[PDB]
Write a protein that binds this DNA or RNA. Sequence first.
DNA 1: GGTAGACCCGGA
DNA 2: CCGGGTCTAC
Length: 252
Amino acid sequence: PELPEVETIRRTLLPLIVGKTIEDVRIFWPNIIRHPRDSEAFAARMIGQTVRGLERRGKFLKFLLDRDALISHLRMEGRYAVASALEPLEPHTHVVFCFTDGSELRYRDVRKFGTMHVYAKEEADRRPPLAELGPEPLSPAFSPAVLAERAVKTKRSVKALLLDCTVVAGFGNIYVDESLFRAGILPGRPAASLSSKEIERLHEEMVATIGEAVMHLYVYGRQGNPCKRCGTPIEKTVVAGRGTHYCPRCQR
DNA sequence: GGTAGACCCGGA
DNA sequence: CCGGGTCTAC
Ligand SMILES: [Zn+2]
């Protein structure tokens, strides 16, 4: 899921788990667990804790328990569900948190690509994977001035800059391409070549792009089809080792 | 500071 | 053999 879908998951999942107490944690693919390094320690430590909250940072979910925070990334195919311990698990279920009321929070992932880390709540923000994560794109902490500062100092393309998780949290390939299109900026432009006007416009479109979705695509996956604004065929290239989609007329 | 390997596997 | 995102390794 992209950032807006992760926000919907956070909002939806919270009431289904808040106040519930963990009675067991079952792990069917231990490699998902990244901290503690031993999946047996991960499971042991969570037993007896109650779910108190659920927050999001970038595309990470942060489950707040009594003492610990569980930081979860679903990547593109991970999914959570709350369901009865009496019913058979869905295929590709890798981790299950069993609650004392006979319900479960289940993590499933055909790609087995997701990650979980657990630390004391107070340590979570300064440890991987949240350490160094940039500001929320919808926060005042993400500003044209913050963007301008990072752009001036780099040799990289503007696409590469926006894909850097330390610049802004949870902007992936799709919203990077879409934001650049809406701002009229070619993805392969060096970040340091953008004018002040271009940085301001890009910031505005990034916020609009994420903001509207959290509440139709112009270029992403649309190569060969006409631009929705000028009718020019959308093109696809490689920029910063990613599939990159753009209108060669609208973007400069 | 900036690139690359490592995770993962359904479908081309 | 490719795709994604985000960490660890050069
Ligand atoms: Zn166009």
